[PDB]
Design an enzyme around this catalytic site. Sequence first.
Site, mmCIF file in Angstrom:
data_model
loop_
_atom_site.group_PDB
_atom_site.id
_atom_site.type_symbol
_atom_site.label_atom_id
_atom_site.label_comp_id
_atom_site.label_asym_id
_atom_site.label_seq_id
_atom_site.Cartn_x
_atom_site.Cartn_y
_atom_site.Cartn_z
ATOM 1 N N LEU A 70 40.002 29.828 44.177
ATOM 2 C CA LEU A 70 39.483 30.236 45.398
ATOM 3 C C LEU A 70 37.950 31.007 45.591
ATOM 4 O O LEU A 70 37.522 31.305 44.539
ATOM 5 C CB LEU A 70 40.237 31.494 45.903
ATOM 6 C CG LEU A 70 41.626 31.150 46.307
ATOM 7 C CD1 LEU A 70 42.823 32.292 46.372
ATOM 8 C CD2 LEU A 70 41.787 30.573 47.760
ATOM 9 N N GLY B 209 36.007 36.724 35.772
ATOM 10 C CA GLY B 209 36.857 35.409 35.798
ATOM 11 C C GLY B 209 36.932 34.728 36.909
ATOM 12 O O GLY B 209 36.395 34.527 37.445
ATOM 13 N N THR B 210 38.368 34.125 37.145
ATOM 14 C CA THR B 210 38.686 33.460 38.415
ATOM 15 C C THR B 210 39.762 33.857 39.325
ATOM 16 O O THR B 210 40.287 35.015 38.839
ATOM 17 C CB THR B 210 39.272 31.890 37.759
ATOM 18 O OG1 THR B 210 40.397 32.164 37.099
ATOM 19 C CG2 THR B 210 38.227 31.252 36.886
ATOM 20 N N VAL B 211 39.819 33.477 40.297
ATOM 21 C CA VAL B 211 40.896 34.068 41.478
ATOM 22 C C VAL B 211 41.602 32.609 41.826
ATOM 23 O O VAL B 211 40.835 31.860 42.263
ATOM 24 C CB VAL B 211 40.403 34.685 42.738
ATOM 25 C CG1 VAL B 211 41.376 34.847 43.704
ATOM 26 C CG2 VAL B 211 39.771 36.241 42.155
ATOM 27 N N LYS C 110 43.997 37.367 40.160
ATOM 28 C CA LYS C 110 42.946 37.468 39.562
ATOM 29 C C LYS C 110 43.176 37.564 38.085
ATOM 30 O O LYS C 110 44.452 37.894 37.661
ATOM 31 C CB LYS C 110 42.327 39.128 39.888
ATOM 32 C CG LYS C 110 41.138 39.044 40.653
ATOM 33 C CD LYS C 110 40.427 40.363 40.553
ATOM 34 C CE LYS C 110 39.757 40.548 42.214
ATOM 35 N NZ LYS C 110 38.438 41.544 41.858
ATOM 36 N N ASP D 144 34.211 51.012 47.346
ATOM 37 C CA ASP D 144 33.623 49.575 47.561
ATOM 38 C C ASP D 144 34.188 49.192 48.915
ATOM 39 O O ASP D 144 34.568 48.072 49.074
ATOM 40 C CB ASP D 144 34.090 48.931 46.273
ATOM 41 C CG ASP D 144 33.375 47.536 46.293
ATOM 42 O OD1 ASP D 144 32.170 47.558 46.876
ATOM 43 O OD2 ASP D 144 33.735 46.473 45.260
#
Length: 265
Positions: A14, A15-17, A34, A126
């Site tokens: 969409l 480290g990585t998602v 995640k 955030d």
Amino acid sequence: YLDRKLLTLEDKELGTVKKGYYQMKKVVKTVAVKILKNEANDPALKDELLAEANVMQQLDNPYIVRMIGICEAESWMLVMEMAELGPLNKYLQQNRHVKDKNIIELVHQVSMGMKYLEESNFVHRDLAARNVLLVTQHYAKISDFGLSKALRADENYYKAQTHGKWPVKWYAPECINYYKFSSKSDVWSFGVLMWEAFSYGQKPYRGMKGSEVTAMLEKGERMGCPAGCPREMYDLMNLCWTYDVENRPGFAAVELRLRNYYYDV
Ligand SMILES: CCN(c1nc(NC2=CCC3=CNN(CCCO)C3=C2)ncc1F)c1cccc2[nH]ncc12
């Protein structure tokens, strides 16, 4: 802890998602995951997502992304219910004809989730348009609790030891100057988020360094009104950007100002 056998991850990130599907007791639920590396692992990253999961486990509101759980498998995974349309800033960059009423609806939903978070005495830390995810074009949820903190019982603020690597363009002056984070600090960030949403996902304080932003704000200067932004909404941004933390509104007061119906205070 989740069963890896019940989780299917799509290859195209969409480290990585990654997008996935998690088999519940009856239906399958669409999820966003995640993913952290198991071998070349960063322990601080692992600690952050574990802390994030600990916060999520304690939250329950329609305007906050729901956690499904953690899956420990070929990689470490944090599994959330998928908000299909993704980040609000990207959505507005790609959809420039979303009506004012609709942007107000979305930011009102964020204010409702934040009013709950404030009531719950957690600080987000955030709160930016990138971290608002759309379920639909008429339903927003708050995400990314990686920097969130549960406030102590005797204080209305979280005190950071010193400045870390922070989203300074979204931070209130007391955060930058004294490293103190309250729900009022999140109200300031919410003002920047509003500016982003009415500027169709443009970045705030374009071309400025963090130090230049701090000097601008100390001088009492603020970002100008986005082109075509409703005047009432720009006024609310300026109230969110109240320098003095004690005179700035909390989310109860901000949420009232985003309602599109008559009410009593
Ligand atoms: C933002 C990533 N994400 C989610 N993502 C989504 N939906 C998205 C749908 C479409 C999309 C396109 N880009 N992104 C952002 C990817 C991260 O940079 C997208 C996210 N829904 C729910 C989600 F929870 C997450 C998953 C796991 C833990 C998490 N903590 N904070 C966010 C997050």
